[PDB]
Amino acid sequence: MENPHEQVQANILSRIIGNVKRLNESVAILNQELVTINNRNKNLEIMGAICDNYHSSVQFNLEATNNKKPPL
Amino acid sequence: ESLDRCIDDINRAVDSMSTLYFKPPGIFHNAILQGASNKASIRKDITRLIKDCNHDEAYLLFKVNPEKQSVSRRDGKEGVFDYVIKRDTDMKRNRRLGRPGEKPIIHVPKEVYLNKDRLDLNNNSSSGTFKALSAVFKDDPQIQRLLYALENGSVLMEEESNNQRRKTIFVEDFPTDLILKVMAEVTDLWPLTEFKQDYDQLYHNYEQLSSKLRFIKKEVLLQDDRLKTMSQYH
């Protein structure tokens, strides 16, 4: 009566769409988490920057005067 | 008169220099400076400040928790570790709620050490061991009342008869198995070797004399039914 494969493809294609949709949703959720982390990590580099600055500054001070003692 | 007034002025000044007090060095000052003064001094200070514990003794007194790399007392009674670490933990949790850090960041464990070390210097009412026990056994009234009894000689238990009244029950009244189980959990809470040898000696005493006694008891029961049988016979 009708080409047997058509319905199969239909069903198969339907499944494709479904899981792809889930893919979408999954990916979207990932973005949300990712986004949150970045804002929640907006403090960390701040600390690091100061720490970096601090380290650099002390080394500069250790060249300003010759109090730099030799390593061990 | 001016010379007299200058005289009283300088007298007040000299009294003032008499009253001046310069703050003496404190604790960590002394610790770090003596631990960095001289090689003999640094060795003596590193010996005084941090003494290595006997691994046997530390194992006998403390649970060591390698998965979290923590140390706690075996009985579970809170110490300075429990107070300090729990305070740090709920500080961390409060900060996770966005609450700001507290000032000073370093807190001396004042009250916990107070309420106990002034008591030591002077040296619900049950001590820590029985409290931890009652925590560790189940809520069975028999075992809890046995604990009550051995804590104060005898337990004031309430009569099951319709005449509700309080009556005393002594330690010998509970079965020997229950008191032996109490002693077993006790020596489990204190793995110290003297207690272990006391327990295996006493439990081997039980396993010979009382277990042989129980065997003889069932056997006399059977032999006494034999006595009744022969008495009916003649």
């Binding site: 493809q9 198969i12 494709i16 893919l23 999954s26 959720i29 | -």
Partner: protein, 70 residues
């Protein structure tokens, strides 16, 4: 070439259409499972470690903000 054989080729193209759709389904499902069960839990554990990181060094943070008014 042939006629019965060209109908055979017609059925053939049907066949690799079908199996190609099967492969597409399988690969997309594997990608979905990879995202759901592996990548997102790793992002979550990374969040946990970053929480511990920012959490432990916070006393430096209070010391810094008490003077720098940041």
């Amino acid at each position: 070439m042939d006629s019965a054989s060209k109908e055979e080729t017609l059925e053939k193209l049907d066949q690799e259409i079908t199996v190609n759709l099967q492969k597409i389904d399988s690969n997309l499902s594997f990608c979905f499972h990879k995202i759901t069960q592996d990548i997102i839990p790793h992002v979550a554990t990374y969040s946990e470690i970053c929480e511990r990181i920012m959490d432990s060094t916070e006393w430096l943070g209070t010391m810094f903000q008490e003077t720098g008014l940041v």
